[PDB]
């Protein structure tokens, strides 16, 4: 028996919506503590991690850990059949080869039942150490999103830099160069050492499809190490993206 009821079903649409662009298939690890999912993009440059704590669902019941291999494109397509104001409930049997999703309309007149086919994923859980970062930037998610869409029109790489209590992204290409200096204002910068990296803008622009999930994003960075882009979800979990610097 796996069953999880989410009253605010929109969250789960925005989640699939955010994964699907980066990766096609991933394995959903279900356990009493909740839902965990992890995967690198297909070229191993980046990685997404989702946690949805059992606390965060309105109903949660797990009898035995499970690991469902999900075609994320299929599931996102099924989720589009959910109203943005629907109660969404997920449900899985014994060793079953399928996931049932149930969408109930607030009223109480429409109930939609979908049975998604699962697939065999032979994936290897990756280990993700927690560490202390040099610069940590909390900012509005839309600003982040727009900054990245903007520099995208100028070149393929963004140089993220923190100096005296302030951050800056820069880029250049055919058309000329440009940069964007944010200042500590709501923009909160936690610096203990100045830092300077280059990343593929193409990936950040995948990352920012999680914007609808939070008004807030935090960028974490240290010399020579993956950038972590985090979107806290409601009071339920997080969605994290990690990105290798450009060599």
């Amino acid at each position: 028996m796996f069953e999880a009821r989410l009253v605010q079903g929109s969250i789960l649409k925005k989640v699939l919506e955010a994964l699907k662009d980066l990766i096609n298939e991933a394995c959903w690890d279900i356990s009493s503590s909740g839902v965990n999912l992890q995967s690198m993009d297909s070229s191993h440059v980046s990685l997404v991690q989702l946690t949805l704590r059992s606390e965060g669902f309105d109903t949660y019941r797990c009898d035995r850990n499970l690991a469902m291999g999900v075609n994320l494109t299929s599931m996102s397509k099924i989720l589009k059949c959910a109203g943005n104001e629907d109660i969404i409930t997920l449900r899985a049997e014994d060793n079953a080869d399928t996931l049932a999703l149930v969408f109930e309309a607030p009223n109480q007149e429409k109930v939609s039942d979908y049975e998604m086919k699962l697939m065999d994923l032979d994936v290897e859980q990756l280990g993700i150490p927690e560490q202390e970062y040099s610069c940590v930037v909390k900012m509005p998610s839309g600003e982040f999103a727009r900054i990245c869409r903007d520099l995208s029109h100028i070149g393929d790489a963004v140089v993220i830099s923190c100096a005296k209590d302030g951050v800056k992204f820069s880029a250049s290409g055919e058309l000329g160069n440009g940069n964007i200096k944010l200042s500590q204002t709501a923009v909160t910068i936690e610096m203990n050492e100045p830092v300077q990296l280059t990343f593929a803008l193409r990936y950040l622009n995948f990352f920012t499809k999680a914007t609808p999930l939070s008004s807030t994003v935090t960028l974490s960075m240290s010399a020579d190490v993956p950038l972590v882009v985090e979107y806290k979800i409601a009071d339920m979990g997080h969605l994290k993206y990690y990105l290798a610097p450009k060599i």
Partner: peptide, 13 residues
Amino acid sequence: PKHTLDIFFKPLT
């Protein structure tokens, strides 16, 4: 490029 992430996150036997 590829696999530049592998070096940081390895597969946990």
